[PDB]
Enzyme design. Structure first.
Site: not given
Length: 208
Positions: A7, A162
């Protein structure tokens, strides 16, 4: 060999400060600074639209998103830096023959920009973004298309992020998932396959 899909925000880069500043600017210009939150970090998570949505609630208007993607792109990098160990980890993973890629839900034209300014761009065999191709996470097309354009089966990939969205994407896409504990954890109900407390632990994890 193996693919590691990362990410961007809260994982590879610590962009909270710049985001909050761009938001402060947007709200001031729009005449809505009274809605600036007391603790902004719990609002930074799935894109500019989701942040303004969470901050403005019913006061949200679509033309605001574009005001934000403006103030924030003349200061895309002021306080933002890669997390400690990230530069070492990318180079390390790349030299041991791992395909690396950034699958984010932030504008793809911008995902390439912030990374160019931080000198991380070159480690990635591909940089998929918030718009790139048709759908954002949670799944699973951004991850499957990103893996086809690379030559690897999901069973050889690892999503490092996350959010609940990252875990669902990999789960639906067939990849492995790992929580970047060093980043800004936003998990709610999901559970990843692994937990990485430090970026270098990634180098470790892919050892044997």
């Amino acid at each position: 060999m193996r693919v590691i899909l990362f990410d961007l925000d809260g994982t590879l880069i610590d962009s909270a400060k710049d985001i909050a500043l761009a938001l402060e600017k947007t709200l001031k210009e729009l005449g809505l600074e009274e809605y600036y939150p007391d603790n902004v970090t719990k609002y930074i998570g799935g894109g500019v639209r989701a942040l303004l949505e969470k901050v403005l609630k019913d006061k949200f208007r679509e033309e605001y998103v574009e005001v934000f993607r403006k103030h924030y792109l003349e200061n895309p990098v002021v306080y933002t830096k890669p997390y400690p160990e990230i530069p070492y980890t990318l180079e390390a993973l790349k030299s041991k023959g791992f395909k690396l890629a950034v699958v984010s839900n932030k504008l793809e034209e911008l995902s390439k920009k912030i990374l160019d300014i931080l000198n991380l761009s070159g480690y990635f065999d591909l940089i998929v973004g918030g718009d790139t191709f048709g759908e954002k996470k949670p799944s699973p097309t951004p991850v499957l298309k990103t893996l086809e354009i690379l030559g690897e089966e999901p069973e050889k990939a690892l999503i490092v992020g996350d959010t609940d969205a990252d875990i669902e994407a990999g789960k639906r896409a067939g990849t492995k998932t790992a929580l970047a504990l060093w980043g800004y954890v936003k998990l709610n109900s999901q559970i990843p396959d692994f937990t990485l407390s430090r970026p270098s632990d990634l180098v470790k994890l892919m050892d044997n």
